[PDB]
Protein backbone atom coordinates (compact mmCIF):
# COMPACT_ATOMS: atom_id res chain seq x y z
CA UNK A 1 0.00 0.00 0.00
CA UNK A 2 3.12 2.24 1.03
CA UNK A 3 5.57 3.63 -1.47
CA UNK A 4 9.36 3.18 -0.74
CA UNK A 5 12.29 3.05 -2.44
CA UNK A 6 11.33 4.35 -6.33
CA UNK A 7 13.64 3.63 -9.14
CA UNK A 8 16.61 5.42 -9.83
CA UNK A 9 16.56 8.60 -12.86
CA UNK A 10 19.26 9.35 -14.78
CA UNK A 11 19.09 11.86 -17.46
CA UNK A 12 21.44 14.22 -17.07
CA UNK A 13 25.24 12.69 -15.36
CA UNK A 14 29.10 13.79 -15.88
CA UNK A 15 29.86 12.00 -19.21
CA UNK A 16 27.08 11.64 -20.97
CA UNK A 17 27.11 11.68 -24.42
CA UNK A 18 24.55 12.92 -27.21
CA UNK A 19 24.96 12.87 -30.69
CA UNK A 20 23.45 15.92 -32.13
CA UNK A 21 22.71 16.41 -35.80
CA UNK A 22 21.79 19.64 -37.58
CA UNK A 23 21.94 21.42 -40.56
CA UNK A 24 24.36 23.92 -40.74
CA UNK A 25 23.84 26.85 -43.08
CA UNK A 26 26.42 28.69 -44.02
CA UNK A 27 26.23 32.38 -45.25
CA UNK A 28 29.32 34.07 -46.58
CA UNK A 29 30.36 35.76 -49.99
CA UNK A 30 30.02 39.41 -50.27
CA UNK A 31 32.71 40.32 -52.69
CA UNK A 32 36.38 39.43 -53.06
CA UNK A 33 38.91 41.77 -52.04
CA UNK A 34 42.37 42.11 -54.96
CA UNK A 35 45.17 44.45 -53.07
CA UNK A 36 46.84 45.19 -56.17
CA UNK A 37 47.70 43.30 -60.07
CA UNK A 38 50.23 43.74 -62.44
CA UNK A 39 47.57 44.86 -64.88
CA UNK A 40 47.59 48.55 -62.81
CA UNK A 41 43.43 48.49 -62.86
CA UNK A 42 41.69 47.97 -59.64
CA UNK A 43 38.54 45.85 -61.00
CA UNK A 44 36.14 44.26 -58.45
CA UNK A 45 35.00 40.45 -58.51
CA UNK A 46 32.14 38.76 -57.03
CA UNK A 47 31.88 35.48 -55.05
CA UNK A 48 28.61 32.99 -55.18
CA UNK A 49 27.94 29.88 -53.96
CA UNK A 50 25.48 27.04 -54.97
CA UNK A 51 22.24 26.44 -52.95
CA UNK A 52 21.53 22.61 -52.22
CA UNK A 53 20.85 20.29 -49.39
CA UNK A 54 23.16 19.97 -46.52
CA UNK A 55 23.44 18.22 -42.87
CA UNK A 56 26.37 18.33 -39.83
CA UNK A 57 26.83 16.25 -37.38
CA UNK A 58 28.61 17.64 -34.01
CA UNK A 59 29.01 15.09 -30.76
CA UNK A 60 27.65 17.14 -27.36
CA UNK A 61 29.08 15.82 -23.99
CA UNK A 62 27.21 16.24 -20.96
CA UNK A 63 29.74 16.78 -18.20
CA UNK A 64 27.79 19.19 -15.84
CA UNK A 65 24.11 20.01 -15.51
CA UNK A 66 24.76 23.96 -15.70
CA UNK A 67 27.42 23.69 -18.73
CA UNK A 68 28.11 21.14 -21.75
CA UNK A 69 30.37 20.81 -24.60
CA UNK A 70 29.93 20.59 -28.27
CA UNK A 71 32.00 19.12 -31.60
CA UNK A 72 30.50 20.55 -34.57
CA UNK A 73 31.97 18.55 -37.51
CA UNK A 74 31.08 17.35 -41.20
CA UNK A 75 31.97 15.31 -44.50
CA UNK A 76 30.59 17.31 -47.18
CA UNK A 77 31.16 16.97 -50.49
CA UNK A 78 33.18 18.99 -53.54
CA UNK A 79 31.37 21.85 -54.41
CA UNK A 80 32.16 24.55 -56.98
CA UNK A 81 31.78 28.47 -55.97
CA UNK A 82 32.19 31.72 -58.23
CA UNK A 83 34.33 34.24 -57.09
CA UNK A 84 35.99 36.49 -60.04
CA UNK A 85 34.42 39.60 -62.41
CA UNK A 86 34.95 37.57 -65.95
CA UNK A 87 35.28 33.96 -64.02
CA UNK A 88 32.22 34.20 -62.15
CA UNK A 89 29.95 35.10 -64.68
CA UNK A 90 31.20 31.85 -66.69
CA UNK A 91 29.88 29.73 -63.00
CA UNK A 92 33.36 27.80 -62.75
CA UNK A 93 35.87 29.70 -60.44
CA UNK A 94 36.82 27.53 -57.92
CA UNK A 95 35.82 23.93 -56.78
CA UNK A 96 36.93 22.27 -53.47
CA UNK A 97 36.05 20.02 -50.34
CA UNK A 98 34.24 21.48 -47.23
CA UNK A 99 36.53 20.97 -44.26
CA UNK A 100 34.01 23.00 -41.54
CA UNK A 101 35.96 21.99 -37.83
CA UNK A 102 34.14 24.28 -34.74
CA UNK A 103 34.86 22.59 -31.10
CA UNK A 104 33.05 25.02 -28.89
CA UNK A 105 30.99 24.28 -25.37
CA UNK A 106 27.52 25.44 -24.64
CA UNK A 107 27.09 27.98 -21.06
CA UNK A 108 23.98 29.13 -19.77
CA UNK A 109 23.87 33.07 -18.90
CA UNK A 110 21.60 35.45 -16.93
CA UNK A 111 18.38 36.73 -19.22
CA UNK A 112 15.14 38.29 -18.54
CA UNK A 113 13.68 38.38 -22.24
CA UNK A 114 11.24 35.30 -22.70
CA UNK A 115 13.57 33.02 -24.75
CA UNK A 116 16.37 32.21 -22.05
CA UNK A 117 18.83 30.56 -24.57
CA UNK A 118 22.57 29.68 -23.79
CA UNK A 119 25.93 30.53 -24.77
CA UNK A 120 28.85 28.67 -25.86
CA UNK A 121 32.75 29.80 -27.45
CA UNK A 122 35.34 27.60 -28.20
CA UNK A 123 37.92 27.08 -31.40
CA UNK A 124 36.21 26.85 -34.99
CA UNK A 125 38.56 25.93 -38.18
CA UNK A 126 37.86 25.74 -41.54
CA UNK A 127 39.75 24.14 -44.15
CA UNK A 128 39.07 22.32 -47.21
CA UNK A 129 40.30 20.23 -49.57
CA UNK A 130 42.93 21.16 -52.16
CA UNK A 131 40.86 20.07 -55.72
CA UNK A 132 40.63 22.92 -58.22
CA UNK A 133 40.10 26.74 -57.13
CA UNK A 134 40.68 29.78 -58.81
CA UNK A 135 40.14 30.15 -62.39
CA UNK A 136 43.74 29.92 -62.72
CA UNK A 137 46.22 26.58 -63.29
CA UNK A 138 44.76 24.40 -60.34
CA UNK A 139 44.91 27.67 -57.60
CA UNK A 140 44.73 26.82 -54.16
CA UNK A 141 42.94 28.47 -51.28
CA UNK A 142 44.43 29.10 -47.70
CA UNK A 143 42.26 27.83 -45.14
CA UNK A 144 41.42 30.02 -41.74
CA UNK A 145 40.89 28.80 -38.04
CA UNK A 146 40.28 31.34 -35.15
CA UNK A 147 37.49 31.13 -31.95
CA UNK A 148 34.00 31.31 -32.76
CA UNK A 149 31.05 32.12 -30.69
CA UNK A 150 27.96 29.65 -30.54
CA UNK A 151 24.14 30.84 -29.50
CA UNK A 152 20.75 28.48 -29.33
CA UNK A 153 19.25 25.99 -27.23
CA UNK A 154 19.19 22.58 -26.98
CA UNK A 155 16.14 20.87 -25.37
CA UNK A 156 14.38 17.01 -25.78
CA UNK A 157 11.31 17.12 -27.56
CA UNK A 158 9.23 13.67 -27.94
CA UNK A 159 10.41 10.36 -26.95
CA UNK A 160 14.24 9.26 -28.32
CA UNK A 161 14.42 12.31 -30.37
CA UNK A 162 15.68 15.75 -28.50
CA UNK A 163 15.66 18.94 -30.50
CA UNK A 164 18.77 21.08 -31.25
CA UNK A 165 19.10 25.13 -32.50
CA UNK A 166 21.65 27.23 -32.65
CA UNK A 167 24.00 29.69 -35.00
CA UNK A 168 27.84 29.97 -34.97
CA UNK A 169 29.45 33.52 -35.64
CA UNK A 170 33.38 34.54 -36.37
CA UNK A 171 34.35 36.64 -38.45
CA UNK A 172 37.93 36.28 -40.09
CA UNK A 173 39.91 36.78 -43.47
CA UNK A 174 40.90 33.81 -46.13
CA UNK A 175 43.57 33.36 -48.94
CA UNK A 176 43.99 32.40 -51.76
CA UNK A 177 47.60 30.99 -53.76
CA UNK A 178 49.28 28.46 -55.58
CA UNK A 179 50.36 27.94 -59.03
CA UNK A 180 52.03 25.12 -61.50
CA UNK A 181 55.13 26.88 -63.08
CA UNK A 182 55.07 31.00 -62.77
CA UNK A 183 54.27 32.65 -59.73
CA UNK A 184 50.97 32.29 -58.01
CA UNK A 185 48.30 35.09 -56.73
CA UNK A 186 48.49 35.67 -53.11
CA UNK A 187 45.07 37.26 -52.45
CA UNK A 188 42.92 38.02 -49.30
CA UNK A 189 39.46 38.59 -48.33
CA UNK A 190 37.80 39.63 -44.91
CA UNK A 191 34.02 37.93 -44.45
CA UNK A 192 31.80 37.55 -41.96
CA UNK A 193 30.90 33.80 -42.62
CA UNK A 194 27.89 33.17 -40.32
CA UNK A 195 26.30 29.37 -39.37
CA UNK A 196 23.31 28.13 -38.63
CA UNK A 197 22.91 24.91 -37.20
CA UNK A 198 18.87 23.28 -37.04
CA UNK A 199 18.06 19.63 -36.55
CA UNK A 200 17.87 17.11 -33.70
CA UNK A 201 19.72 15.13 -31.49
CA UNK A 202 20.04 11.91 -29.44
CA UNK A 203 21.13 11.43 -25.57
CA UNK A 204 23.26 8.22 -24.85
CA UNK A 205 24.86 6.85 -21.58
CA UNK A 206 27.99 5.18 -21.78
CA UNK A 207 27.99 1.58 -21.75
CA UNK A 208 31.07 1.04 -18.96
CA UNK A 209 30.02 0.41 -15.29
CA UNK A 210 31.95 2.22 -12.37
CA UNK A 211 32.05 0.75 -8.97
Known amino acids: ?22 FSK ?16 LPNADVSIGNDTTLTFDIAYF ?9 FVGVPARAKFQGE ?5 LGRVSEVDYGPAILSLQYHYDSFERLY ?4 VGVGRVLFFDKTDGAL ?7 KWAPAFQVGLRY ?23 TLGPVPVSTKIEVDPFILSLGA ?8 ALE
Open 1 to 22: MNENYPAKSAGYNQGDWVASFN
Open 26 to 41: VYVGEELGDLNVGGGA
Open 63 to 71: VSSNIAVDF
Open 85 to 89: KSISS
Open 117 to 120: PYVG
Open 137 to 143: SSFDIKD
Open 156 to 178: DLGNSWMLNSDVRYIPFKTDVTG
Open 201 to 208: SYVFKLAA
